[PDB]
Amino acid sequence: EPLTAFETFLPRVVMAEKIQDYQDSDAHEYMKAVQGYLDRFAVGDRLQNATRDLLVTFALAETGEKLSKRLPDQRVYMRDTFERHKDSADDRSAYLRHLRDTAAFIGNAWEPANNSPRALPGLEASAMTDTVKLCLAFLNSLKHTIAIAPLVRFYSEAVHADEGEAREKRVAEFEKAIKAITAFTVFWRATRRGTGNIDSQYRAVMAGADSLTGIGPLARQWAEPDATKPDPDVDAEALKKELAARLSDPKGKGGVPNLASFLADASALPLYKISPPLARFLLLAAYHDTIEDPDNPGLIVQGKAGVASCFTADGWEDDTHLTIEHIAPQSATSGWDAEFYSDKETVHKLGNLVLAPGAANASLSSRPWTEKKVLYAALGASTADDAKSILNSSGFTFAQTTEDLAAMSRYLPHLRALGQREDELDPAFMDQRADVLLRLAYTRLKGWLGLELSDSSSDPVVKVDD
Amino acid sequence: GEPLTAFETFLPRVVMAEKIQQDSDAHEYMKAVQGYLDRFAVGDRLQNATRDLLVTFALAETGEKLSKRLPDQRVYMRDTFERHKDSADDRSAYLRHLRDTAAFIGNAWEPANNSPRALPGLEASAMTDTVKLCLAFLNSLKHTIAIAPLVRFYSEAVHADEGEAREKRVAEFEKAIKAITAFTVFWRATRRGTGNIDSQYRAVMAGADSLTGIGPLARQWAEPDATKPDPDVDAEALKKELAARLSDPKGKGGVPNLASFLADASALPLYKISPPLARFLLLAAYHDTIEDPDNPGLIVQGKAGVASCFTADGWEDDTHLTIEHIAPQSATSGWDAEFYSDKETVHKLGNLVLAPGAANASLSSRPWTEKKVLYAALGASTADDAKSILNSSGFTFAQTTEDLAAMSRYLPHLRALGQREDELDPAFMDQRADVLLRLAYTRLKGWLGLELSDSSSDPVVKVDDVE
Amino acid sequence: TTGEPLTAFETFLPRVVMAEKIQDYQDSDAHEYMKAVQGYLDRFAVGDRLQNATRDLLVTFALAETGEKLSKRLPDQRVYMRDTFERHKDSADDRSAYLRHLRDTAAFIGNAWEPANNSPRALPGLEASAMTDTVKLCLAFLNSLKHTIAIAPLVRFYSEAVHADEGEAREKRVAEFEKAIKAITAFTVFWRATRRGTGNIDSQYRAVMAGADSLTGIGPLARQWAEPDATKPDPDVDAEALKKELAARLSDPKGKGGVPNLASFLADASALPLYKISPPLARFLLLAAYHDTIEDPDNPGLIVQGKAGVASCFTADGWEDDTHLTIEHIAPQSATSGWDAEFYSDKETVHKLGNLVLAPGAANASLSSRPWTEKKVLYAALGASTADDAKSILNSSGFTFAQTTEDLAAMSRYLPHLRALGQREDELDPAFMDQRADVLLRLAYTRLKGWLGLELSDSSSDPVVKVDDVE
Amino acid sequence: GEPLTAFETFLPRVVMAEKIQDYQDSDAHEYMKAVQGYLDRFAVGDRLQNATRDLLVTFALAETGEKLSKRLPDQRVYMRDTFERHKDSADDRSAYLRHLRDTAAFIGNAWEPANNSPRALPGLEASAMTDTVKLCLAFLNSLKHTIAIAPLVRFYSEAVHADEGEAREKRVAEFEKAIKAITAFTVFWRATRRGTGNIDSQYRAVMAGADSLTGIGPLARQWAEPDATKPDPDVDAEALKKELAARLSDPKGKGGVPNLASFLADASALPLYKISPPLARFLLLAAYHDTIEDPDNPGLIVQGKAGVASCFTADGWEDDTHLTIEHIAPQSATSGWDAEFYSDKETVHKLGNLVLAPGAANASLSSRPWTEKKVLYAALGASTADDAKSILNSSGFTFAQTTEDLAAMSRYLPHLRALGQREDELDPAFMDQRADVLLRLAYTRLKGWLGLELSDSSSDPVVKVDDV
């Protein structure tokens, strides 16, 4: 098997310490850690793939990167940018520290080992807050590896920082950073058909350039080797405002200038087919602390804080109680308005999606709305007794026992709401539903990015396309 | 048809004062409480739930310690309702308080069948990891007495103005929950029975015999009438008061220094007394540990975040972290008979590990010689090393190599035991218990403001709790 | 893994690293302090020099942390080192101050005691002001005497001066360091001047570090207690405590220093061949004695205190000045003509303080083995105020010396003890040198006395037990 | 046969006071014998003449601040003039003579000690002879700054006359404060000006002063206008310090140096080594003291740990062999070197081009290409002689001296280590940056001696002014 660009770099990291002779040299503790992470992968492709992917994100993190997957190209760069630190002792030290930090992060925070939780090595478990846990989980699910580079940067700084006040400040900044990255990615991705090359945006941020804000590079060092000015990993506005603008500024390639355009873009796409993880993240954002709408029978509205909370790491992980389920079946089925199957994409838009217990699926699948209405009313009941009363009160006999479905019952307003809807369901209604949902989601993620799009609404609004 | 609860008897009474005036919003607080009770089936469940709601209510409004009997419950409600016959806003905040205790018991303490835990009116942020872990633990322990003080801090967090005020009171709620939990853990770990902890909490609520300058924790005074406001504080008041109740010679907590805590806890069959308590202690102990390079089979604190388990997740993780006995619970071969001199030996902290529950089929009643390989394997960094270890050994276990390797996880305390070359005796488990109880103490210490002297015997009475 | 033994320090390094599971290590405090110690050892070549340097660093370390005389043997050092690090397993800050202490002793040995090849002496972390004239003179002398035992107590005061807050705190501890250095030095000089061999001074210092038979109320001087565990604090204090403890050890009937009054000091010192025992000690005594002296108007061969600053030699400069102030014997070391045979009855006579002068070293070629009659002119000349009078004196004499008149005049300098001897008309005998020694030892005592807080009885005769160090 | 010095002419004039009868006078005799003592040191002829007239000159500055000429008849007078001022009082013609004793004492022991003796302050303990005092005396003497004698005698005289214990010590510490202030003032004035710029004139004013910028009056013992209504004394701690501080640094003053920018600009520009090698040396020692090689600007230095590399000391001053002033760009046009350096004949002599290096090595450094000088500095500045060997051998070069030999002269010297690390070629621009760094560090070190605090405001308020 071919030697990875990593093992080719170790001799180079040994000719470069004179002689500790190492190990006792520092590199050999940072470098041992990285080895620790790679040892996790079996010789052959897994070891190859893991190493080249570690190096790729490394390049983005030390300089805006875009280092290719090909091996000879990686053997360089490692060479290139170590020679940059031939002279200084402490600077070929911080560099290697940086490589340790990216392996630390990928291995523990991004893709933890088989049974372990997620962690930020060197940072306490307090740092591993609920929001941090939910974003890591989501970004990973989306396979958004590009987000690793900016994240390592804030992690690296949190570790290196002095204990007490310094560490905490940088830890809180890490959360601010993770939120901003996530919200930006969600908004960009919800509002576009494909990936629309988000990656290209992130690299530009890392490297700097095309900076909508006054802000400079996010990588550790400058791509142009030499120094006249410092480089700062700051997120309080810097990441936030820069990303905010990249999405929402006419000068930016994010084609989303106001609320009405966001709603129009997202409403229109088959989000479930594009990215089930994204659909799920949006649904959780939307349904969190909602209550059935007293005036619009199908709909929901924001309610008491903590009354129906799902927008959490636990909620993300909870496939068992909160599975994505289609209201209008994915396929033409009787008991349903044919309008829904004009466009193959209709059934997959946010408005048609609910979160329901996964087991019930056997009873919900391909049934007329008449049947589903009872099921949602039941599955959304406050006690299993009410579910029992609802299910029996109905004439229907479902695929599962009354006793069984009642067990799966839980307080879920969006389900209760749909159960109360007396009027028939059509694509027009799902569009209204999507609007309601996308608004609530926006209201929840908005703060993460510092967004405040015009809800001038038509008046002083230009419904713009990307 | 069946006999009416002391709750329904109270609603007429809440209406003759409403008092029309569906017309009254007080109905809204009262409607909410009804919401919670409707959850219980007519008969025993409805009766039990209502009388338990009222009991904690009494402690929270007053230190009353209201009995289980029904006629005695009809009485309180009228007793302490009339107290608020005159003022409009004061029979309002009172009812608000009853709403808050039902809100709390129903959502925070014992949530509905498939829902998470919540603090109604407080955001999901308030539902922090530590808050979630303590609620989970206290519930598991069935420590219902902790509800009364907790409602009090909840109630205040709700009632507080948005923004700065709410957050301050929310942070205080966490401080409070930690202090209550640490206090309960320390008290309970260090005593044979329940040692009447309850009596301590009620005293705090009232609270009699306050070691610190601090006054009652309930909403109102048990002696009906007012000259001064009622304290409801924690940042020292609850913390220091509880700290002292455990650790002060004047207090009934018989634990004056570290050496005595270690001596008391080391000696008890904690697993038999309270498996929940054993588990909470083990999680505290093992959190961010690394195998000891000098004392084989022992552990020491390590890098922050390297092996964290002291979390809500860890508490809930029965699948990866099950309590397992090192020396089998019963006399079995491959094991020193020393362990079965005292039927309590096997159940002391030092003999307990956290391991994946599935493996149990392979660990059960096996000689140490084997358990050593199993722990070494189950605690491995990769499943490849687990394979390497299991195969390397001669043994064939109840489960396939492939299977056990799958259960591998990085767990230093297991790695540590796998490296131990010397035979295991009760002397070693006692050393183990010492190490563990110290780490636990180090972790819970901050929750209570504790700082017991460890003089390493330096000027140290090793003191027993006093009959 | 090459050749000869691995030093205790290297063995210890692995242990110092295991003790830091959580953090760093590089970030670790230890591998900053420990890098510094490495700095000092790197100075020595592989083999004996590296071995010797390391084991000696560890020895003084032991005395300084716990007043324990750690042996030279390696296995004993590997162990001594582990023992007392495990004492600080638990606390972060306490295995930190401990390592700081090891840094401080290497800092001190390397810069203050035996500086690098061309560098001055320094107290790392302390300003150059701290490097006062007296500090410089004592370090120079103690080093010359090879009094390595003094390193342990000295590190202790240094360590505290560094660790102290800037401004008032640092200065107070720096001034205490000088007080300390004086006391150590004066005590060592008095003990050693008054005894035949080393009389085991070392044993005294170790007792102080540990002490342990403390004549004063004073407790240990080491950082920590040899008996591992703590109930009470330990002080490195110098002025309230140190002078007094040392003072008593020399001068108290309960103490092993056998020197209870002035008359016994004078009797003990007068009698020993100090120059043979320790030329450095003789030199330090002579400088103390001759400092600010003037020829005695009433006794021809002798000297008395004079105006402040008139003829100062008791200084770092004076100590270093081998060129102008070399120890020279008045009666030649061997039987030579022109000299009374009395001087060679006892082989030790010629080497007692009274027979020693400080003179320019070059002149030696002209002074060597010459009759007194000549040496008299030479001293009179070499001690002259101007080189003109020196020429006046040398020419005025009939003699032709080994060096030209012009040459010797060039070395002429104002030196009363030389002027005084040149005026002595009466012949020189051992009786006269004894009187000389008395005068000298008194002046020395008067100068060093303050350093130690001493005030010995000169009452006697009226009341003088002239006591011997034995019995 | 040669003319009688104004001193011997003054003894007849002195005895009349006692006059013929007493001691006689015993006190005066003791004082005279002491001054006579000092003069006896000089050979009859020119040396005796010169020494006596110079003793009298500084005496005049110290007693009346009068700038007495070198000519003899003018000296026989003033002596006469100012003794008749004390015809009446016994104790006042006593303190006067005491003052003359003190100036001879000072010149003879503190300023120019006898052939092999150390420096001393007669009547003051050896403690008084502190390191800073020793370094300043040594420097001022080297600079030939005889004008500084007058103010210094004044503080000495007062330290002697003062009661033992508290009084003496206070006046002794004041003598150090005084010596620092005089020295710093002289260094700053002289570093910043082309010629001597008549510093002397400044000092005289202070003694008689006279044109005071501060409220302070004369520094001499007595008033030049003979008669008394008020006492004359100056504490330096405010007075000498503040007065001198202002004379250098005040728009009203003839010192044309109002801020840091102007100081740096003035000093950077002058061929200091050619103007005054002693001054260059004093500045270099100030600058290099406790420095460490700059991690960002190679070849540059920055302040470091206290006591890591101390050279600003009496020992350092005297240490010619270890710390000799050496030019980086050779004094003359040589190959291996940028011709830029020889545009202006003065360039090579500016502070930035000067290092302190062991004097013996000179045989290996002289007129060599930089490429070599770089290795040599790196080697000579090494921490151990092993590293010096490592460096010298590691280089291809063979120098005038053996590797073994040069390694021996090795000493820890950051400014040398720093230059050894410099990869970029050397030009006049670099030496200017170097001079800036050095002059700043020197300023930071001497600043406290004078109570100075010049605006480093310049980017905010640069100015900056020239002198005159």
Residue numbers in the entry:
A (entry chain B): 334 to 799
B (entry chain D): 333 to 353, 356 to 801
C (entry chain A): 331 to 801
D (entry chain C): 333 to 800
Please give sentences taken from the publication describing this entry.
However, the side chains of the C-terminal half, including residues 327-771, could not be resolved due to the mediocre resolution of the X-ray diffraction. The crystal structure had four molecules in the asymmetric unit of SspECTD. Each molecule exhibited an α-helical fold with only a handful of β-sheets.
